[PDB]
């Protein structure tokens, strides 16, 4: 099974996917985030952040509240299972995490914590 996915965020505050599957045979999984937009990180930043569905709102709220210099993530936020850095136009960033950190049955969500994010700038992550 493939153990990596390629995700893009654009100038419209949109990922080009709303659902990621992670095969349970993968020991590590890698998300390759890129930004094919024109706008710089300060005005149109994207990151890819993973948490349980219950923690998502808190991660996003405290993250926006932390500011750009903190990558819009609260420091030492244990709710964050994995994340990329925040990136602007023409940048890329990959995160590899251990799939064992995921549990069968639990509900996981991926999302971006740059302020202005819509209710749909998020997605499901599911084991298969």
Total of residues contacting its own copies (CB under 8 A): 55
* Residue ranges in 79-118 that form contacts with its own copies under rule CB under 8 A: 85-91, 104-107, 109, 115-117
Q: Residues 33-62: x/- map of binding to its own copies (CB under 8 A)?
A: ---xxxxxxxxx--------xxxxxx--xx
- The counts of H helices and E strands in the chain are 2, 8
Exactly one of 5, 7, 64, 99 binds its own copies (CB under 8 A); that residue is 64
3-state secondary structure at position 28 = strand
12 closest CA partner among 30, 33, 38? 38
Considering the complex, state which of residue 28 and residue 36 has its C-beta at the smaller distance from its own copies. 36
The reply on whether position 9 binds its own copies by CB under 8 A is no
30 closest CA partner among 83, 104, 85? 83
């Amino acid at each position: 099974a493939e153990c990596s996915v390629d995700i893009q965020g654009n100038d419209q505050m949109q990922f080009n996917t709303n659902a990621i599957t992670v095969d349970k045979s993968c020991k590590q999984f890698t998300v390759n985030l890129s930004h094919p937009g024109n706008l710089p990180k300060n005005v149109m930043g994207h990151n890819w952040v993973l948490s349980t569905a219950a923690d998502m709102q808190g991660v996003v709220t405290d993250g926006m509240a932390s500011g750009l210099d903190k990558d819009y993530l609260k420091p030492d936020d244990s709710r964050v299972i994995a994340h990329t850095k925040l990136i602007g136009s023409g940048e890329k960033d990959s995160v590899t995490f251990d799939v064992s950190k995921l549990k069968e049955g639990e509900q996981y969500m991926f999302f971006c914590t740059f302020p202005g994010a819509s209710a749909l700038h998020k997605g499901t992550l599911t084991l298969k």
